Amino acid sequence: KDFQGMLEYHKEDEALLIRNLVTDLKPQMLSGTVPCLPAYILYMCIRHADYTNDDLKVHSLLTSTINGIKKVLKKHNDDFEMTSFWLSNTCRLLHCLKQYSGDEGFMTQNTAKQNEHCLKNFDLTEYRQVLSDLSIQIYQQLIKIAEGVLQPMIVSAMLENESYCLEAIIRQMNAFHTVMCDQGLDPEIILQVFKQLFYMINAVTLNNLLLRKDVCSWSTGMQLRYNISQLEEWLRGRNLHQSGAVQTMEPLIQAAQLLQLKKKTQEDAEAICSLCTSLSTQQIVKILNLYTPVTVAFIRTIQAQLQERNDPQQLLLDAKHMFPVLFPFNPSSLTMDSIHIPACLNLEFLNEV
């Protein structure tokens, strides 16, 4: 019957809709069609509402929605899968609003058939600002989960020799990546996640060797450098080096080197300075004092040069520092004119129109 890309519900069942399509929607439901069918399916409804000029239907549809995404988010703070899921979905529902209600500004990459599918009667920039605000919050939640999973693995998989090993950490990083990719999450958010996680690994580890028993040794310098390089080769293999995540470890790379570099003669001390640029002069001196196989006056010559470059600053780098998110628009090629809505979901009460 020549389906336009649209769907109508009875102004009522809006509840039913939002529950079967959000609340009771488990992602392991594949989809099988679209990792973010929900996002699309919703826009197809926004469209039917724009068609009818039913501003009450739009405002209600995406405020019920946000209530359901927030709801289910809170009943799952803990699970990386759902957050991952509802993060990309949210994000796509936002990409669709930009891609279709948008103006010539976002219509620079649409097929006529796409520029035909756009919203004609509403400007939904207000909800566009709300959904992005939300998906900043979902991302934060996702970092909270991932941090929870990794925190108890960082100091063990690194710094100890041998119940966690760089294998566990690297198995985790795959798990996280796998789910995110399978969820259809944009590749720039995947890149932004692993830059966060790696920064934590740098912060939590370097914190520890500025504290522990007591900073550890030439041995511990060599496991870090190996560990980082295995993390770095992991990045190169999943093609995530351009995420900036290896940069987020230059203090640890320098700490590790600080532990191996020769500490004695002056020529030695000259080195420590020119290499350890990313560490603070009290962090170096600390890692010096804590060493265990360094003398004062080998320390004095050090702190003699690095005079405010730069110290002090709060030691113990708060790994919770959460770098800002950024969701570059990314329109999609798929067209709602052909999109599979399975039956396994009881959305039949939707009319194809």
Author numbering: 1464 to 1625, 1651 to 1781, 1789 to 1848
Authors' own words:
Type V myosin (MyoV) motors move protein complexes, organelles, vesicles, and mRNAs along actin cables. The C-terminal globular domain (GD) defines this class of myosins and mediates the majority of cargo interactions. In this study, we describe the high-resolution X-ray structures of the GDs from human Myo5a and Myo5b as well as low-resolution SAXS-surface envelopes for all three human MyoV paralogs.
The structure of Myo5b GD was solved at 3.1 Å resolution by molecular replacement using Myo5a GD as template. The asymmetric unit contains one Myo5b molecule (Rwork = 0.25, Rfree = 0.31), which shares with Myo5a the overall conservation of domain organization. No electron density was visible for the N-terminal four amino acids, for loop I from amino acids 1625 to 1651 and for loop II (1781 to 1789). Myo5a and Myo5b GDs share 70.5% identical amino acids. A higher degree of deviation was observed for Myo5b. However, these two residues are fully conserved in all three paralogs (red-boxed amino acids) and are in the same position in Myo5a, Myo5b, and Myo5c. This observation suggests that autoinhibition might not be limited to Myo5a.
